[PDB]
Ligand binder design. Structure first.
Ligand code: CUO
Lengths: 70, 70
């Protein structure tokens, strides 16, 4: 039960963690890292394959699957 | 209500720790109901004074306080 709350409700400590965590995430060299994670949604496009000539953006947008993907 | 002391909003910088919180948390600590109540009640008093302030007919006074909707 990880809890998601309104951003406003959040405690300073709660905020503290998020700020530090994201900042560290930014640094994260790993594929799990933030920059890498960002690429999932859009450019660089990963969808057809991570290395493919034509790449499309990962958007199952305009589809029923859309909420699940997000 | 003469909340002369607007100072109430002057919480701590960490922001979680507040006077109310410190006071309340301590009250929570006691197992005994009686012990709990003494701490509990005093914490209760602070708001009455803070809002009522100097004003003769207000939260601050036992007589008048029930009149205010706060
Ligand atoms: O981004 Cu693809 O949806 Cu909000």
């Amino acid at each position: 039960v990880m809890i998601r709350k309104d951003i406003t409700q959040l405690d300073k400590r709660q905020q503290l963690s998020l700020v530090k965590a994201l900042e560290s995430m930014k640094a994260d060299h790993s594929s799990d890292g933030f920059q890498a994670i960002a690429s999932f949604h859009a450019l660089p496009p990963l969808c057809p394959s991570p290395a493919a000539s034509k790449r499309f953006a990962c958007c199952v947008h305009g589809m029923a699957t859309f909420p699940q993907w997000h | 209500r003469d909340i002369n002391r607007d100072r109430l909003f002057q919480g701590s910088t960490k922001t979680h720790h507040n006077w109310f919180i410190e006071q309340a948390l301590l009250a929570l600590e006691q197992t005994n109901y009686c012990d709990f109540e003494v701490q509990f009640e005093i914490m209760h008093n602070g708001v009455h004074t803070w809002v009522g302030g100097k004003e003769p007919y207000g939260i601050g006074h036992l007589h008048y306080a029930s009149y205010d909707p706060l």
